[PDB]
């Protein structure tokens, strides 16, 4: 429930959260394709600005090493679609979350991008809250009976929920076990054209962020000014392959 009426200059709060759990791995002789919603080419219909909702366009692109996976807010370009730099956490608010375009990579003729794929996504709604700022598209009059003496101002009706990856377990692991490409979904049955192989991996089950604390001084009592806190994360991989020689 809550809360009455405190819309003001800045209502931003320091909030932390855990993301949706996602495991996936793909293999192909061509880089994978990801899809995301971005500020679309202007414009469908015409003609005027400003501050209106930007047009949306589903952009298919190549997934590069370092691109962000979806979190709990979709695959979109937060740098363009959220101009306040404050609607999502700092690690995604200035980049783009890309989601794999399984449909397109499976429907391509040769199928050079999907030798195979494995995936496991899971999340639930942790908490709910509303956005501060002006409602660009207000609730129609037919759907709300206006009040109220007091109240009278329709509350912010822009709802978003924090995600949560729930439980991570060893039984849910996709890795540390071999996969044998018995049969490929596409026509390319595991042939590494160009003598190269693209292996895409997303693993959020080992996302633990280590906290480091270095002392600048050591006062007689405990003082927060004596310490600096740092964030550090690590990733350990071991790629093992077994190839078969073929002649043409």
């Amino acid at each position, epitope marked *: 429930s809550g809360s009455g009426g405190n*819309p*003001g*200059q800045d209502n931003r709060v320091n909030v932390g959260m855990d993301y949706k759990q996602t495991q996936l791995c793909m293999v192909g002789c061509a880089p994978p394709l990801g899809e995301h919603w971005g500020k679309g080419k202007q414009c469908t219909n015409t003609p005027v600005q400003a501050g209106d909702c930007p047009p949306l366009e589903l952009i298919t692109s190549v997934i590069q090493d370092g691109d962000m996976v979806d979190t709990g807010f979709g695959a979109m370009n937060f740098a363009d679609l959220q101009t306040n730099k404050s609607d999502v956490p700092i690690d995604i608010c200035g980049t783009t979350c890309k989601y794999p375009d399984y449909l397109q990579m499976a429907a391509d003729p040769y199928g050079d991008r999907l030798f195979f794929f494995l995936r496991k996504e899971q999340m639930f709604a942790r908490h709910f809250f509303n956005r501060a700022g*002006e*409602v*660009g598209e207000p609730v129609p009059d037919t759907l709300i009976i206006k009040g109220s003496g007091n109240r*009278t*101002s*329709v509350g912010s009706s822009i709802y978003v929920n924090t995600p949560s990856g729930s439980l991570v377990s060893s039984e849910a692991q996709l890795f540390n076990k071999p996969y044998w490409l018995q049969k490929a979904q596409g026509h390319n049955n595991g042939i590494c054209w160009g003598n190269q192989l693209f292996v895409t991996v997303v693993d959020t089950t080992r996302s633990t962020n280590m906290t480091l604390c270095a002392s600048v001084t050591t006062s007689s009592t405990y003082t927060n000014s004596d310490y600096k806190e740092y964030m550090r994360h690590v990733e350990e991989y071991d790629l093992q392959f077994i190839f078969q020689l073929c002649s043409i």
Partner: antibody
């Protein structure tokens, strides 16, 4: 390109009603919070009320309740302010103000001003 | 009814100087205070809103400050175009109220 045009000055005898109009504030889906301000050469500025197009919500001042009536036409248009029994204390310049999209405090977009003279 | 009390009705200064107009609230209004400029024969123009935020338009010459019950508008170095009335407004609770007029005149 965001200016507000009003009805125009009017000379009214005492005991008759007058209706003031505004323009280009109050559209479908947008959204504005329209306010009206009275300017008496002695009392400075006095806030009248706040009306919201797309909802037609209405808030008034206890001083002006029963004196000022507010209406909003969702198509076009908006915002009509009418005063009933006009007396000598109503001779003032009335403004139609709209803070951009919403809120109270902000009047960055003022009307041209309408001078009402209630006298014989 | 929150009463907006401005110190002086008229204010003297000269070109280039620094002027500070005070606005005292009868209640705590946080930072829900706005300032306006009105020239003779014209409609008021918004200058500062939310105590210390300049509106699109207004030069860095104008600076707002204060919180709670004491608010101040400061004009760091003046121009002839700044001669007008200046009002402060409260929007913490209904009804909305304004302060008395304040005329700025030059000592040229």
């Amino acid at each position: 390109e965001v200016q507000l045009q009003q009805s125009g000055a009017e000379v009214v005898r005492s005991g008759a009603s007058v209706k003031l109009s505004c323009t280009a504030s109050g559209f479908n889906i947008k959204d504005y919070a329209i306010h009206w301000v009275k300017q008496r050469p002695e009392k400075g500025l006095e806030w009248i009320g706040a009306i919201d197009p797309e909802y037609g919500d209405t808030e008034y001042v206890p001083k002006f309740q029963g004196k000022a009536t507010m209406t909003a036409d969702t198509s076009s248009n908006t915002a009509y302010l009418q005063l009933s029994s006009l007396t000598s204390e109503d001779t003032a310049v009335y403004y139609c103000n709209a803070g951009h999209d919403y809120d109270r405090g902000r009047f960055p977009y003022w009307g041209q001003g309408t001078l009402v003279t209630v006298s014989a | 009814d929150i009463v907006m009390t401005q110190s002086q009705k008229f204010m003297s200064t000269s070109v280039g100087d620094r002027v500070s107009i005070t606005c005292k609230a009868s209640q705590n209004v946080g930072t829900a205070v706005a300032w306006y400029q009105q020239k003779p024969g014209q409609s008021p123009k918004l200058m500062i809103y939310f105590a210390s935020n300049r509106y699109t338009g207004v030069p860095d010459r104008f600076t707002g400050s204060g919180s709670g019950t004491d608010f101040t508008l400061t004009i760091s170095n003046m121009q002839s175009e700044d001669l007008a009335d200046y009002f402060c407004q409260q929007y913490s609770s209904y009804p909305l109220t304004f302060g008395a007029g304040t005329k700025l005149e030059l000592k040229r």
